[PDB]
Write a structure and sequence with these properties.
By secondary structure, chain A is α+β, with helices and mostly antiparallel strands. Helices cover 15% and strands 17% of the residues of chain A. Chain A: Belongs to the totivirus major capsid protein family.
Chain lengths: 60, 50, 50
């Protein structure tokens, strides 16, 4: 595919166009974002290593 | 409330002590310690969330 | 020396951003394709001369 304007190439820019279906939006309505809107803050256990001057946090 | 207040500021200022002593080149660092912990949808990570 | 006579063109993308207007769109749970999406910055901030 090629397009020309003013004897110069006209290039298509922006995002990738998809084939929007009725189902693609109403599955997110079926989902509703059913994650109970409750601010659950999870902790980080500090872990000490050779230097000790600098700190290092782990996930569990 | 006086006892609940000192309990909260003592908990925060102790942890900000040993958060200031981590290098920026790390997973959980100075800038990105709030985002990974929070599992909700607040407007902006400020105030009581931090 | 034939390579370096004619000036090569550097394609700089147009500067546009709408985070300042709508800060609700940027929150604590960001979308990323790769899980190693913060490695390049963490590398530069640690070792700039590399």
């Amino acid at each position: 595919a090629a397009m020309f304007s003013r004897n110069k190439p006209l290039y298509m820019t922006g995002g990738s166009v998809r084939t929007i279906a009725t189902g693609n939006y109403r599955d997110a309505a079926e989902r509703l974002r059913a994650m109970d809107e409750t601010l659950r803050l999870k902790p980080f256990k500090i872990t000490e290593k050779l230097d000790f001057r600098v700190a290092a946090y782990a996930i569990p | 409330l006086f006892y609940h207040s000192v309990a909260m500021i003592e908990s925060c200022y102790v942890e900000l002590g040993n958060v200031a002593r981590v290098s920026d080149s790390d997973a959980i660092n100075k800038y990105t310690f709030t985002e990974l912990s929070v599992q909700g949808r607040p407007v902006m990570n400020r105030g009581i969330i931090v | 020396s034939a390579w370096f006579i004619n000036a090569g063109m550097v394609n700089m993308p147009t500067l546009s951003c709408a985070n300042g207007y709508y800060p609700a769109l940027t929150n604590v749970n960001p979308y990323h394709r790769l899980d190693t999406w913060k490695d390049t910055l963490n590398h530069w901030v640690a070792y700039p001369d590399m």
